[PDB]
Amino acid sequence: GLKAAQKTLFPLRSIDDVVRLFAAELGREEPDLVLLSLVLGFVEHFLAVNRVGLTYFPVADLSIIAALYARFTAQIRGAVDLSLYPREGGVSSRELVKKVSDVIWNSLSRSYFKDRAHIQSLFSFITGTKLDSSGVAFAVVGACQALGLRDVHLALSEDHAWVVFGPNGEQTAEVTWHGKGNEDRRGQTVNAGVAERSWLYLKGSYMRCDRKMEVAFMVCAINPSIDLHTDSLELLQLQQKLLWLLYDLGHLERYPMALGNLADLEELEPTPGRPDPLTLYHKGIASAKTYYRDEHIYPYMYLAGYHCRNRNVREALQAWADTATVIQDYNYCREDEEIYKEFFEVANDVIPNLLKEAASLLEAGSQGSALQDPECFAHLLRFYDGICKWEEGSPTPVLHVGWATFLVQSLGRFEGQVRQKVRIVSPVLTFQSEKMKGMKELLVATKINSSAIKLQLTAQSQVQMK
Numbered sequence: 001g002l003k004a005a006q007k008t009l010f011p012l013r014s015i016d017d018v019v020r021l022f023a024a025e026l027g028r029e030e031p032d033l034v035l036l037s038l039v040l041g042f043v044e045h046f047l048a049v050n051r052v053g054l055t056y057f058p059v060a061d062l063s064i065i066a067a068l069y070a071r072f073t074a075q076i077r078g079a080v081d082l083s084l085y086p087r088e089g090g091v092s093s094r095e096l097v098k099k100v101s102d103v104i105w106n107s108l109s110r111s112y113f114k115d116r117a118h119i120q121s122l123f124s125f126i127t128g129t130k131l132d133s134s135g136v137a138f139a140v141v142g143a144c145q146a147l148g149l150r151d152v153h154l155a156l157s158e159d160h161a162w163v164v165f166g167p168n169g170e171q172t173a174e175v176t177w178h179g180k181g182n183e184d185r186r187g188q189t190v191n192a193g194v195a196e197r198s199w200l201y202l203k204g205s206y207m208r209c210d211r212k213m214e215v216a217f218m219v220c221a222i223n224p225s226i227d228l229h230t231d232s233l234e235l236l237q238l239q240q241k242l243l244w245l246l247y248d249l250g251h252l253e254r255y256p257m258a259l260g261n262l263a264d265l266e267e268l269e270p271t272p273g274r275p276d277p278l279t280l281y282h283k284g285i286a287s288a289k290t291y292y293r294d295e296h297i298y299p300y301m302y303l304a305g306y307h308c309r310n311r312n313v314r315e316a317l318q319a320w321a322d323t324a325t326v327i328q329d330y331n332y333c334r335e336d337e338e339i340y341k342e343f344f345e346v347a348n349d350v351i352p353n354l355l356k357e358a359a360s361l362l363e364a365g366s367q368g369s370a371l372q373d374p375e376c377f378a379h380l381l382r383f384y385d386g387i388c389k390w391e392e393g394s395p396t397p398v399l400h401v402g403w404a405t406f407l408v409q410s411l412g413r414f415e416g417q418v419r420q421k422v423r424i425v426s427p428v429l430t431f432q433s434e435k436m437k438g439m440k441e442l443l444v445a446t447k448i449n450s451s452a453i454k455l456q457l458t459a460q461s462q463v464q465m466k
């Protein structure tokens with residue numbers, strides 16, 4: 001059901017031929033999501049899943065891609081009868097969106113590993129009857145576009161996906177599952193999650209994609225991994241080129257995660273003449289500030305990871321403190337476990353390892369060490385302050401004694417003469433959380449009072465009886 005003009009670039013014989021196809025589609029009124037996702041899934045399958053026979057690039061013949069496209073469009077058009085769902089006002093109804101979501105859901109294998117790699121694309125849907133969670137949401141949007149439903153668009157948070165549709169694109173509907181063991185809410189709005197101020201729904205500051213941002217999503221979705229130790233260089237090059245295409249056309253402007261993904265790719269293999277990874281992480285943060293009220297966690301996490309890998313301890317601490325400054329205005333809710341896991345690993349594994357190495361290097365005579373810099377101690381304190389403020393008013397707690405052991409260790413890496421230089425005002429720091437306010441006294445003693453720290457961080461009421 002492809003148009004003549006969509007077929008003229010075939011066969012695709014290289015990475016650059018795939019980029020030309022994307023450029024041509026992006027120059028259209030509506031880029032064809034189904035065509036583009038089938039092409040990426042086909043090339044990913046033959047570059048990462050099965051490389052038998054590979055000599056340069058997996059040639060994508062029109063006959064092959066057109067037959068896959070026909071399989072998809074026949075499946076959707078046959079199973080969704082539009083006459084049963086009249087379109088009032090050129091916009092779609094909740095019943096129609098639910099029907100398309102059910103069609104995709106009911107097509108999937110009964111049982112499979114939902115966390116596998118390479119199950120994101122429409123190629124996986126057609127050839128393997130398998131999709132991952134956000135892959136189902138994308139497939140609903142592709143199916144709606146195939147049906148002529150121009151109002152149905154992908155909605156993305158940092159850990160979940162759903163659709164928007166209807167009058168002014170103001171309706172929301174769940175179309176896929178989230179996480180593992182959670183009961184699905186397909187067909188419902190996301191209002192209760194927005195109202196409860198969970199990270200999962202970003203207080204309503206989630207992405208409402210247009211079609212070009214949906215192209216950017218499938219490009220972010222490319223998975224170059226061949227196995228635990230090995231990435232496809234061909235898929236890395238393709239993903240990086242397509243991200244630059246999108247960047248140049250303006251379609252990453254409102255997509256912080258895509259800018260961090262591009263910066264990560266540039267760190268691995270920089271493109272001559274292009275912005276540095278740092279510039280790109282900063283544009284990701286600027287995008288979040290401009291379009292999403294600075295309510296996103298990952299723009300700062302991407303920046304912190306880059307500084308961590310480069311052992312810029314000062315700047316890694318600052319960027320994690322900034323992540324905590326975002327999280328402090330959320331309530332920690334059921335289904336936010338992924339961001340809890342990330343903050344736990346930063347506090348209880350990554351920061352301790354960085355400071356352990358810093359301590360060894362200070363023993364060896366380093367100058368300008370983070371451990372002698374009171375501004376770095378302040379960043380450490382601000383990171384814990386935001387985590388404590390996050391916990392306030394949340395329906396489930398965050399901190400426990402496991403966190404306290406690492407806090408004491410991390411504090412102890414800074415000498416008392418460095419800790420004393422931070423000014424805690426009601427380097428200068430203001431605490432927002434009642435936990436860190438009560439800890440202020442303790443933060444300056446030559447020997448940290450471990451037991452009193454533990455009591456203040458966990459709000460534990462009592463010590464051992466005997």
Ligand SMILES: Cc1nnc(N2CCN(c3ncnc4sc(CC(F)(F)F)cc34)CC2)s1
Pocket residue numbers: 134156157158159160161217220257258261298301302305
């Ligand atoms: C620091 C970080 N390093 N990698 C990070 N990733 C990997 C890239 N990710 C993403 N990159 C582009 N777009 C999206 S939309 C989305 C939510 C989902 F999966 F649709 F439900 C995730 C995500 C998720 C966050 S954060």
